[PDB]
Amino acid sequence: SRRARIERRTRESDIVIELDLDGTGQVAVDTGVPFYDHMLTALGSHASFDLTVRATGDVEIEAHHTIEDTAIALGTALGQALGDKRGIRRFGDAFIPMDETLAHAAVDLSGRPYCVHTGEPDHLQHTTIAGSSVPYHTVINRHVFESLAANARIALHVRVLYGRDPHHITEAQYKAVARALRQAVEPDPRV
Amino acid sequence: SRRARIERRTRESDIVIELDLDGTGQVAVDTGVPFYDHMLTALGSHASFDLTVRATGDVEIEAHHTIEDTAIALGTALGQALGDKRGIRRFGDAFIPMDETLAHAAVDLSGRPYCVHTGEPDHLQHTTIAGSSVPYHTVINRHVFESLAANARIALHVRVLYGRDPHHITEAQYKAVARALRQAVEPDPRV
Amino acid sequence: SRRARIERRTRESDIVIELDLDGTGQVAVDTGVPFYDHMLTALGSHASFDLTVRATGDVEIEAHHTIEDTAIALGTALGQALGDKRGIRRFGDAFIPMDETLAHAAVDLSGRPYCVHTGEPDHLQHTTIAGSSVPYHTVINRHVFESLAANARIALHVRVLYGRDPHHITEAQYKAVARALRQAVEPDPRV
Amino acid sequence: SRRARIERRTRESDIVIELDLDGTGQVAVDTGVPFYDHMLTALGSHASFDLTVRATGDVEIEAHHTIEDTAIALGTALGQALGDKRGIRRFGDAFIPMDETLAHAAVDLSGRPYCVHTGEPDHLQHTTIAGSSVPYHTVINRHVFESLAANARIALHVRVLYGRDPHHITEAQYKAVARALRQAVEPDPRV
Amino acid sequence: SRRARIERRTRESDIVIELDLDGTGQVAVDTGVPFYDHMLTALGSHASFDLTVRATGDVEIEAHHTIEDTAIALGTALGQALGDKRGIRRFGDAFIPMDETLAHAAVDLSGRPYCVHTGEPDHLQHTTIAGSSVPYHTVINRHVFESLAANARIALHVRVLYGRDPHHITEAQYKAVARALRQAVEPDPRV
Amino acid sequence: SRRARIERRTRESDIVIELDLDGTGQVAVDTGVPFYDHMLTALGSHASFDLTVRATGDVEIEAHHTIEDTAIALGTALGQALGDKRGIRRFGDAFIPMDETLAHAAVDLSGRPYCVHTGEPDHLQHTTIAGSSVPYHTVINRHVFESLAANARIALHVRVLYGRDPHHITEAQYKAVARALRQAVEPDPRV
Ligand SMILES: O=P(O)(O)OC[C@@H](O)[C@@H](O)c1cnc[nH]1
Ligand SMILES: O=P(O)(O)OC[C@@H](O)[C@@H](O)c1cnc[nH]1
Ligand SMILES: O=P(O)(O)OC[C@@H](O)[C@@H](O)c1cnc[nH]1
Ligand SMILES: O=P(O)(O)OC[C@@H](O)[C@@H](O)c1cnc[nH]1
Ligand SMILES: O=P(O)(O)OC[C@@H](O)[C@@H](O)c1cnc[nH]1
Ligand SMILES: O=P(O)(O)OC[C@@H](O)[C@@H](O)c1cnc[nH]1
Ligand SMILES: [Mn+2]
Ligand SMILES: [Mn+2]
Ligand SMILES: [Mn+2]
Ligand SMILES: [Mn+2]
Ligand SMILES: [Mn+2]
Ligand SMILES: [Mn+2]
Ligand SMILES: [Mn+2]
Ligand SMILES: [Mn+2]
Ligand SMILES: [Mn+2]
Ligand SMILES: [Mn+2]
Ligand SMILES: [Mn+2]
Ligand SMILES: [Mn+2]
Ligand SMILES: [Mn+2]
Ligand SMILES: [Mn+2]
Predict the structure, then answer these.
(1) What distance in Å separates the CA atoms of residue A158 and residue A149, rounded to the nearest whole number?
(2) Radius of gyration of the CA atoms of chain E, in A
(3) Quick check: A116 and B95 CB within 8 A?
(4) CATH number of the domain that F125 lies in?
(5) End of a domain among E89, E105, E132?
(6) How far are the Cα atoms of A51, A79, D86 from residue A42, in angstroms, in the given order?
(7) Residues F78/F80/F82/F86 CA torsion (nearest 10 deg)
(8) What are phi and psi of B139, to 5 degrees?
């Protein structure tokens, strides 16, 4: 009903997105960038989407291109699956506490494409989250939310009220966008 | 059931308000102040009210008196239609992104009359929104929310988190009050 | 179903808590600290809990010990009654206007124990709310929210956006925690 | 062996102190000032003294005189019970965390009478801890430590590294003095 | 006598902790995060615990989850092994110089769960300690001490008085917690 | 058992040190610099060393050379007497109140040579302590602690928390190093 399959094949990467807005958190994400996988799994789960994301890109250079193309593809999927947007809440927002962190997101689904990202501590502009694989530079967080908003054609405002740990600060934001989405996407029993 | 008809006839103006709290956004507003009409149409629509507003006043002087009397009348209608206020959510709030702007409103419907309006950029104290008709001075925004809160006898807190365009800044606030209202006015399945 | 009875007997005090998460605001609180009684009655009521709190302690010293033990016991009750936490909203938040005051609370019920309390004016660190009985020092507000979060094992973020009156500032916070709780505790029709 | 009984009868008050340095925390304190009782019970207990304090004074005026005379008497008892001070550690110190508070105390038992009290937040100069009885003004904390040091004829340095709650800030200090005392008073197996 | 075995199996990780408070520094730690292994080996050794820690987690994402779960499990073990806490010193503290660094830790074992971490230079919020394996982001230090304190249900105050090298700054803190623990955990010959 | 005899013959001075770590404060110090004698007598006594120091140098120039050579020799003695350092506490620290002054010292005996000296008031960089004999310039305090740490091959951190009198400020530091030493040097019943 509200589903979309998006294939995005660029020089730098290969993306397949399968999205059902009216899901139960059946989410599977593999991008070659494990922390990104973790963030997108949280987003799909907490938005109660069913979501598959398969992506392979030029991670030898760094995660940037793959992360960006994936977000673009995902935003495109979101718009398509939304369709005419009639009968929905339209607006949604959510606060996410995560230990010391508090993040917030608000959305207007029928609003024009726009992203405002504020409150993220300055050290996240040069912070790396690294494991045994391809690392994630948190400076990309903004890029993701902008790409997503621009291709879903929605208004997305993401705020960090405060926080210290970069993992918490980032996950809380992704989760906040997710629940904001979940709320806004739901059928509105009055309109 | 939760309806009210208010007629307010002063030296400066003539107002008729017809309000149904449990509506579907059937809204018709004509005050002689087209931007005000636009704001009140948004308020009624996004609050899921059914709302008629017919007003004629001394617009040769400026919109102030008509805008004020209308808000007073509308607040009075809101209180009357609310009645004993039993069984309702009581509290409501809403975030409204509008391009670069983010506005918020929170309400307590059984709280004592009170309005706090904060965060609006200083240039809105002397900004005019002008078209082919009677203009709207944004400095009035505050006046409207205060008049509304005082006559509905509710607690109304309106915030602009940030914003640049005066049209966006104002509409986002009106819309925020609307959805806050809509939430608070709804029947609460537990109380 | 989601109920708990907690008895907490220390050197300083004696506490009995009876808690039903799925209640209708049937609340009875007696701690020897009337303003605390007032705050906890508001918390239980606005959270739509059914709640009994009977407590006797060393109020000759001051309210601190009794207030603290009670909050610990109450948090313990909340955790127990929550049980495995499956099927619930998990996240909740609420804004509470109270005349000039605006307070907010956000919760993550499956999050790790954590409390962040911010925005409370400095004069509440040495303010007393006094009547004909045992007085309440508002500096304790923080202590209460921390104790509650630590023993329910949840993430609790409480904010005062602004305010002047200490009674309003405190009640608005207690009420905000209550509605945040109420939301987060509710069954989620999708998970 | 290291015991002392002190009776101090002034215009303002009546004090009896019974002190055994080599005790097990058998402590009983009654001054008419319940919070003071609580602080002195903690001091005796954590210092592993056996301690009886019976005091009646002019509490209609306020606790000051009684609190002061008691501390003087207690310091006098400490000196007497110490006697020639041979064979002891002489020096002692202790850190006391108490939730958000951290306090410290260091002592030189054979040093000349001296007290330095630092780091206590400014609002404790006008803070009251009040219950159902005679209240305790925290501004007195300093007075107590000075009186104690002057009459035991020792060097006593009390610090608050940080803290917020006045009950915690005060109790942590009393407890810190207690454990510092306990350490310094102990027989030194080398001297 | 004072031992505990804790198994903690989450989505993100698998932890087994074996803890004897009354040990001789027989410590074996393997978490997949070699620097963490180094820190926990120092903690167990300097606390004179006997300690086994076996942990496997989602280090492809980064060390965070594994580090956190391990600390939670370890804190839980500490509490269990502590049992009723009767007859012990209760309080402990230790200074650790490490070349240019000076760190301190103080504990109250019967105090309520609480952690205050202060004095760590700002560049440790975005510093990485990297070798041939999974890296360690020092921003996590705080997270570890908080998790540990919350699950052992103790008061833990960790301070860096000063320091420059992140390895020294971190190890000195872990070692300080260890010796503070060791002291506080010991049988008290007077209580 | 843990003893050392050091003879240090330079152009500027002649030093003989006899050191027993496991002593009873049998101390005799003669350097031609009476205040230095006083400081070293305090150090040996409060460290419970047995210590003989005989030194003659070029005091016509000033005390510097003799004070320095003596400290070097003493540090060398400390290291030698320490030997393999097995079975000892390793870490030690001590607070020394002295009227208005509070000083602290912490040591790591198996740590690499390092000295950090902080908190000493600026006027001690040009202060003289003078009597009927060769004077002592307090600026040398630092030099002494550095020389001592470098030749004993230990980590020595000396702090003045506060103080006014240069005699007190200096003696408190020497005494603090002494008790820190005494603690760290003692046999550890667990390692
Ligand atoms: O909190 P959640 O259960 O949604 O997620 C698991 C959580 O343990 C993990 O994502 C995380 C916790 N702290 C940083 N990352
Ligand atoms: O965004 P809405 O569809 O609620 O409203 C129409 C919108 O295009 C218009 O009100 C507006 C857009 N920017 C300023 N004003
Ligand atoms: O506002 P409520 O009806 O939830 O509560 C009664 C209210 O009148 C009282 O609690 C109060 C009003 N101002 C300070 N305290
Ligand atoms: O922490 P202790 O057990 O020494 O003391 C009891 C404690 O619960 C009480 O004195 C207190 C706790 N917070 C303020 N006062
Ligand atoms: O100082 P210890 O012997 O406890 O630890 C060995 C030490 O050489 C090593 O842990 C280290 C030294 N500097 C940074 N790390
Ligand atoms: O305080 P002690 O007994 O360790 O030392 C004697 C003391 O009287 C003397 O060293 C001194 C006192 N004030 C400055 N110097
Ligand atoms: Mn890009
Ligand atoms: Mn907000
Ligand atoms: Mn995570
Ligand atoms: Mn007007
Ligand atoms: Mn418009
Ligand atoms: Mn407390
Ligand atoms: Mn009230
Ligand atoms: Mn006095
Ligand atoms: Mn207390
Ligand atoms: Mn975490
Ligand atoms: Mn210190
Ligand atoms: Mn190391
Ligand atoms: Mn030199
Ligand atoms: Mn002297």
Answers:
(1) 11
(2) 15
(3) no
(4) 3.30.230.40
(5) E89
(6) 11, 20, 68
(7) 150
(8) -50, -30
Note the resolution in Å, 1 decimal: 2.1
Task: Specify whether A117 is located in the same domain as A171.
Answer: yes
Which technique was used to obtain these atomic coordinates? X-ray
Full DSSP string of B102-137: EEEEEEETTSPSEEEEE---GGGGS-EE--SSS-EE
Partner residue facing C95 (CB), from B93, B112, B114: B93
Closest-CA distance, D60 to chain F, in angstroms, reads 36
Indicate the helix (H) or strand (E) that contains C3: strand C3-9
Cross-strand partners of B158: B105, B117
**What values do phi and psi take at C90, rounded to 5?**
80, -55
Q: Which two tokens stand for residue A29?
A: 């994400």
Residues D115 and D182 in one domain: yes
Residue A183, SS3 per DSSP? helix
Q: How far is CA E83 from the centre of its chain?
A: 19
Looking at the structure, do residues A96 and A188 belong to the same domain, yes or no?
Answer: yes
Q: State whether D82 and D122 are in the same domain.
A: no
A162 in contact with chain C, both atoms CB, cutoff 8 A: yes
Q: How many domains in chain B? A: 2
Tell me the residue range of the domain where F20 lies: 1-89
Residues D97, D76, single domain; the answer is: no
| Chain A 56-85, residues with CB within 8 Å of chain E CB atoms | none
C113 touches chain A (CB under 8 A): no
Instruction: Compute the nearest-CA separation of A171 from chain E (Å).
Output: 12
Same domain for D108 and D160?
yes
Nearest by Cα to B185 from B107, B104, B88 = B88
Domain boundary at E55, E89, E123, which? E89
Q: Is C121 on the interface with D (CB under 8 A)?
A: no
Q: Which atom in ligand 2 lies closest to the alpha carbon of residue B175?
A: 4
Shared domain for E76 and E123, answered yes or no, is no
CA distance C24 to chain A (A): 25
What SS3 class is residue B173?
helix
Q: DSSP readout, E15-74?
A: EEEEEESS--S-EEEE-S-HHHHHHHHHHHHHTT-EEEEEEEE-TTT-SHHHHHHHHHHH
Cβ within 8 Å, pair A48-C93: no
d(CA F29, CA F32): 9
